[PDB]
């Protein structure tokens, strides 16, 4: 009855140090709709994160985009942390500029 989220973590635009960009965490395929999604900078929760309006796919599973403005640098590590009723432990997906 319960379907676990798929997670992709990526930038809005091509990733270049020093330029204002946007960090996205796209969560999809999940049911029920209650979900916790955090964006992390060097392991710490980013405060000003927005998300899209809840919608769903043909199979009734839900999808959301979570996003925040960020200026990438060489040292800063970013990730998405997701909790859902299907997960025993929060799941962390690192941002990899190549995916």
């Amino acid at each position: 009855i319960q379907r676990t989220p798929k997670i992709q973590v990526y930038s809005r635009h091509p990733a270049e140090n020093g330029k204002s960009n946007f960090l996205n965490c796209y969560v999809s395929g999940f049911h029920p709709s209650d979900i916790e999604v955090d964006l992390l900078k060097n392991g710490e929760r980013i405060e000003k994160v927005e998300h899209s309006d809840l919608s769903f796919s043909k199979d009734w599973s839900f999808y959301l985009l979570y996003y925040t403005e960020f200026t990438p640098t060489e040292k800063d590590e970013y990730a998405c942390r997701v909790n859902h009723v299907t997960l025993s432990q929060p799941k962390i997906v690192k941002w990899d500029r190549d995916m």
Binding site: I1, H13, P14, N24, Y26, H31, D53, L54, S55, F56
Partner: protein
């Protein structure tokens, strides 16, 4: 090409106090244009695309009336469903509804849809002829009989074949600068080594609209699916979409492999090679 207008509705019961959480969104093609959220302070249907802001206060009054009516129907339904399935008052449950219309390239009616799920599973749907229903179990069959007695299909068919298409045509005209514009994918290829025997080639498609796209790999001109990975199409957040496809190849044999990209914005498919 073809176009669509679709509305999506989600209600989630809240056992111990008050009415369900209700969220409604409307799309033209892959562009969201309205929302309603029961938790928001406005208690209005709200614009989410610049081209719907044109519409006058009478539009916003009528859409707000209609969407609040849908929220009440879902409230009652969550009650009916809990009773039919003999469920307790303790758990939260979900109803979802989607409806709308497809038109072809001539903007004439192609297909209409109206369907309904409980706890994420099919419950009842209008068939393609818009004259009959698909009920998944005996609870839904009781709903079907009810809706047959009240000629519900007839009312929905009139909306889906007529009114729905009329609104879609209006929006496509009003929003033409974006809704009728195709943004072809911006493509490139990356290369990474795992070991010195194995390499990964990744074909990227960025900044495209609408979301439909096909990415395929060939080896020496023949389709290859083994040793490939295709990610789900994802929103960029600026209204465009992104996708990639990768293949693992023997190091030194990268020239054998081509990626092929098909999209409505490309007059002929694109071929990329490392």
């Amino acid at each position: 090409g073809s176009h669509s207008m679709r509305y999506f509705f989600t209600s989630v019961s809240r056992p111990g106090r008050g009415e369900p959480r209700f969220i409604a969104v409307g799309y033209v093609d892959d562009t969201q244009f309205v929302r309603f959220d029961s938790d928001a302070a406005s208690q209005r249907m709200e614009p989410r695309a610049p081209w719907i802001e044109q519409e006058g206060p009478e539009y916003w009054d009528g859409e707000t009336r209609k969407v609040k009516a849908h929220s009440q129907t879902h409230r009652v339904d969550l009650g009916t469903l809990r009773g039919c399935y003999n469920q307790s008052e303790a758990g939260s449950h979900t109803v979802q509804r989607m409806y709308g219309c497809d038109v072809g390239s001539d903007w004439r009616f192609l297909r209409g849809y109206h369907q309904y799920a409980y706890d994420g599973k099919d419950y009842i749907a209008l068939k393609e002829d818009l004259r009959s229903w698909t009920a998944a179990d005996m609870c839904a069959q009781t709903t079907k009989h009810k809706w047959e007695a009240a000629h519900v299909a007839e009312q929905l068919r009139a909306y889906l074949e007529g009114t729905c298409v009329e609104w879609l045509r209006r929006y496509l005209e009003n929003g033409k600068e974006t809704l009728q514009r195709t943004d072809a994918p911006k493509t490139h290829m990356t290369h990474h080594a795992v070991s010195d025997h194995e390499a990964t080639l990744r074909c990227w498609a960025l900044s495209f609209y609408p979301a439909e796209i096909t990415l395929t790999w060939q080896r020496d001109g023949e389709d290859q699916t083994q040793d490939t990975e295709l990610v789900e199409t994802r929103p960029a957040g600026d209204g465009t979409f992104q996708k990639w496809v990768a293949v693992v190849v023997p190091s030194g044999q990268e020239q054998r492999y081509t990626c092929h990209v098909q999209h409505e914005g490309l007059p002929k498919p694109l071929t990329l090679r490392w």
